[model samples]
Target: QQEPDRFDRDRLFSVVSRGVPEELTGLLEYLRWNSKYLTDSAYTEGSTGKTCLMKAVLNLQDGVNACIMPLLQIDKDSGNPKPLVNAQCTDEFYQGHSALHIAIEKRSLQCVKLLVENGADVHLRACGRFFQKHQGTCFYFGELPLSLAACTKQWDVVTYLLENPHQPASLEATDSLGNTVLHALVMIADNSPENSALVIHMYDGLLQMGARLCPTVQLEEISNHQGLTPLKLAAKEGKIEIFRHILQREFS
Candidate 1:
């Protein structure tokens, strides 16, 4: 293991994002030989504070996955790999994101399952400024991984998160903006024909699960800082498509 910056981590992250797992294995074996080169620190880029797992998720490839198990199992003799699997990014932009968050963002159900099965936090909050960046340029999906899955149209993850046996998601959780899982859909209604229909799909699906997006009693009935219920929010946001959908379904 040469100087961590000069040789070790650079090589590790490059192969990680580049999607050549066998080479990553060889490199890990070589680095593991030096006691000074521990698995987590050696493989994690110090400047970015991302374990190779996050890098793997960040740079997903078609027909192949960036390596995973190797990073978790690198030192069976050293310590538990749970922390590595659930490690959060320390940078300001990506802060609070774990490998699982990026996986769902990329719509890779396979990687999402692998991480969750291996002890990833199903409910991790990606509350970084990047997730909530101003100018509406960045995504702000109620912070939780479940909210992200729903808003991003990663419907498979939404089901898995809501139903996974190991760690089912907290269905009605609030985001950094204090919007519950239901409120998240309101924030994202861009009003395009395609976008509105997709938003309605998630809303209807949640309703089928007995989720709390319903506009009245026997539901969440909460709001963000503006104090708008999910129904009220759709109106205030000018989400007329969803607005009428709410009225049509609830007018009875």
Candidate 2:
């Protein structure tokens, strides 16, 4: 039996989340003044399988994000658990996502940077709540945060992480599909029609960074997935130049 008037802290954390674009402002303000309730997830899953930090990064509200940073981290000197402690996981809920995954999807460069700076463990794989049988598949979400940024085409974020000494978006991470960013680009080419300049730039950037493609799988296998590769999808979607560039990558 649930107790009457017992505030549900999970539902009551609006105070901590106030001012984010999609978040509720009025309720958050009320919670800020109340301050007697907070909740923790026994299991690491949300309505969207993303943690609060993931949401902030996904939305890119710098103010709300500023508020969030300390909230998620424990008062290290106080011997309390970090706010992120109750909510950190490295897997996709149903879509092969991580906190880093949502950051890419939302294109919140600042939020992504903050996550790395605050020790969110970018290398964790298959971390969120989902997967009935493949519960601990380490490779499920194994790619580096920068890899996701590149694959998703978040150019600025990718450049930032690659340059930063701390994040060091290593090119070594390979997804379970055995594909790397270089492979991602190559598939983008043979299957589509992207611009030569763009593909050239990507190759130049990776080479400049001292990175290499992981040559673990055939280009054909990537092409066959769901009947599409980066090349085919780009071509089918009218991204002509990007497709062309991908094909050039394979031959050259």
Candidate 3:
């Protein structure tokens, strides 16, 4: 019969952020009768930042329970659960970045695994000034989780995403500018021997996953907004190894 403490919001946010899943979980349980605060977005100023679930995903320290519990809360109306699994952050630090994006960027395999297992959308696209400033040249708007992973050269994350049970069979999904995962891989790879081996592994994995040799069947070349095909981009960027692998894939 007691009211939930207004004082708890800031405290709850801090605990979830610091990676203490239990304290936040306990707070949620105490406030379970009231889902308003649990499901509400925090921070009114500076672009209305992360929710509790978003904060947990951003933390990358604790696993599923911390991140997922708040997300599982039941809505009072319609008797349905809220959609927090694929929640996106609006904060400048996480602008347009989903939990999957943060997890992939942070290289936290565990967090990525937890999010995917909980039904996080791998195909979500993020648009933000920060991404535009930091990754604008490499990734176009509407970047997919797979594309982000590929661009960051997180080979393990890239491989996991490609092979993910939830992932669609085709790896040909494109960003806003019509760039596929293969296209992203080409653009981000450096032309160096050491980098070549990893790039080759990534290319081979994409091939196995049914990524196309070209974006379209009619044209031998499929260009992005920048008018670059995967092969052309590789060659232009001096990624000889990538170009060679793409060549073999094209020919073979």
Candidate 4:
């Protein structure tokens, strides 16, 4: 049922990943030497249950992208190069994170650009596996790439996604928990003024790209399941700068 080379390729990927932390020595470099195989091999690390692309995104130390780019664009039997870009790892330590999620969390803007240009779906939400691993993490189902980027403070990625002509129509859509993109920014942001400033810039850019200020259900009180609106959450979380910014937007 499986290809004869599947196991061998998986083994090769595992071997190459083991040394990623230490400059990818030994078998890792050996695989890199075989440019043909390296371009389309699939691997899943046993410990992390991640493919080479997923692992590279998390580490992103150096030369990881060089090793990854070849595999990225190769057309596979599945019609796309690597399913790993959109693949979700539900393994114990990893949960369900796609390569895009890793890139945003890592704030690797170049990697994000590479994946998007290669047809990575920005609308693919991380499965419940993530919330299961970290109880009370506050992330909800239906969270898109833009939401993750915003919540994680990857403002540059957020801006690019919002401005991208191909971005999802529901750019301001709420997560299952009823948290909109702005609500996410408020909940996850810290109290530091510098972080607040960054969040303000992201908020402005997202608005410019047509993100709604609030839903008609409440406008000024677009609360989540927790009954926390962006402004309310900002006040409750002590995100002083966010509160100030939103307040000015309302009155001005």
Best by lDDT: 1
Provide the clash count, candidate 4.
0
Provide the overall lDDT of each model, using Cα atoms, as 2-decimal numbers.
0.72, 0.49, 0.62, 0.62
Across residues 1-252, which tens digit of lDDT does each residue of candidate 1 receive? 353423477777777777766774455345544543433565666644777778878876662374776655553333544467777776635667788888887888888887887777876777635643553224678888888898888888898887888777866677767787778887877989999889999988877765443335333366677787888988888889988897788877
Segments in model 3 whose C-alpha atoms lie over 4 Å from true places: 25-39, 42-47, 62-82, 127-142, 166-170, 211-223
lDDT of 2: 0.49
Model 2 Cα lDDT, one tens digit per residue, 3-104: 223334454244335533333323333433444212235212454354544544444454226544554442222233443423444434334455565665
Q: List the residue pairs that clash in candidate 1.
A: none
Candidate 3 lDDT, tens digit per residue, 1-252? 565545355776677667644554345444455544444543212335566666666665443435354444422221325455665666534556676787777777777876777667888876524333664322342378877776666767767776768654246677776777777677667777887777678667656555343334423265877888888878887888889887886786
Error of 3 at 154 (Å): 3.6
| Residue 214, model 4: Cα distance from true site in angstroms | 13
Q: Count the backbone clashes (under 3 Å) in each candidate.
A: 0, 24, 0, 0
TM-score of 2: 0.56
Better of 2 and 3 by TM-score: 3
Error of 1 at 78 (Å): 3.4
Per-residue error at 21 for model 3, in Å?
3.4
lDDT of 4 at 47: 35
